[PDB]
Design a protein around this nucleic acid. Structure first.
Lengths: 140, 141, 140, 135
DNA sequence: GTCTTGCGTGTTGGAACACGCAACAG
DNA sequence: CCTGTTGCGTGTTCCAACACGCAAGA
């Protein structure tokens, strides 16, 4: 799924906080070729994250997915705990998205043990198909 | 100038230290050719850093170039580039192939020059005692 | 409070990272003359640091105090932000203390502006009278 | 000396408060910085000669009228001799040196340092030396 | 003098570790 | 209700590239 694009060495997918909101998250409901076809669809909360790399269409130390919009939602042998401060993403002065940090703890809150597996969950600002886009990676 | 590879949206150039040395410096170095000139030949030491972006074929905040190899604080334009840190080594599969040495542009006459936010990362090939170095260029903050 | 000791010119107070822990911080709970009597007691976090020199018993470009053991603790028109790496102090192989760096920013985190006023906060390693000893000086 | 107190005289003090007190040939209450011929010696024998000093010892030595041989080595000058001022008047230069062992320039470097403070003059004569070992 | 690589420690601001305000259930 | 239980932000300190600039020899 990589060299359908025929990429030269050194090139990587380094999307902005801004691109992810506008070009990916927003465009999927609309049906875009490169958008329908370039990122794997999955319910992230059914699995332990260390299973995910083999199920991701690509990635070397980071992976991206679309997952159903929703607390300490259970996944595998653990739970996701919000960390840091949600940040607002703007393009040309409009709020289009929110970047949210999470940390995976194994076990059951608040008796869980922290792990190094991390998520960044990006969402659009809007009232009541409807997905969030998530980045996964491993610390240190 | 990139647009002969129908760029996917979102894609940017973040080659590893290991790739630049080997996939770039060597491809050019065995003197083998590239499909396209992506990293252009230039004499970087004839120039002001602020004129350089105009010379890069692409790059938004970084531009990379190849420049002819020296056979220290080489004067270039209005300044001098000052070396920094400990030159660091690039390895591939347990073999050493290159050193990236960082520099900063000072304007003026050494050592009475003044510091800038301009950085160079210069990648070079290893050898025993058609000769190029590879330079990453960018401006801080 | 200086020439009770009758000092010859050229002499200054240049305590080691090690002396401050052992001879000063540790000895005060014990009631030592030169220790009760040589360093001013103050709650550092009620004041802006540029007020402190007149309230310090001595110092020319540096000042030292004992202050109550405790985040972005407000002081005056600002906040103290941890900087660098906490360092461990040992004497003859025992950890007796920690040296901690801080920088004063004016305003309210994380919208503060950095100033050149600096602190080194030294503390003993022990569960929960109980003070930290702090050095103050000015960059540049 | 009370506990905690150590000798960290400024560049400006050493020149004036020390070198001059001795230099107008005026006396001191106590000899704190002793007279010695430093260039007769190995740096590692020197601490034994300092009347105090834990990591630094300072001494006074008779004055020259370059890489002066001393003991098993030679001292090599470094940096740009730096100037000491007091109240906008220049009074002295501190020049740093390092001890090399052997025969110049085939000698070998050490961790031994000298800072030599000296008095200014026009075209009973001493220099003042700070001694210490690095790292 | 002139002009350098090669080590040192400041300054930054990034993002994770652990405490309670705020809410759902029991 | 009025508490018991089950999540979620938000202010700290950590951890670390990156070079800054004396300073040394080249």
């Amino acid at each position: 799924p990589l060299t359908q694009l025929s990429l030269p060495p050194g090139f990587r997918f380094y999307p902005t906080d801004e691109e992810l909101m506008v070009q990916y998250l927003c465009r999927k409901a609309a049906g875009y070729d490169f958008s329908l076809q370039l990122i794997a669809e999955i319910d992230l909360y059914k699995f332990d994250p260390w299973v995910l790399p083999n199920k991701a269409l690509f990635g070397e130390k980071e992976w991206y997915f679309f997952s159903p919009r929703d607390p300490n939602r259970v996944a595998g042998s653990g739970y996701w705990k919000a960390t840091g401060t949600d940040k607002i993403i703007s393009t040309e002065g409009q709020r289009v998205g929110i970047k949210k940090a999470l940390v995976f703890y194994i076990g059951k809150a608040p008796k869980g043990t922290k792990t190094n597996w991390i998520m960044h969950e990006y969402r659009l600002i809007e009232p009541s198909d409807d997905w969030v886009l998530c980045r996964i990676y491993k610390k240190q």
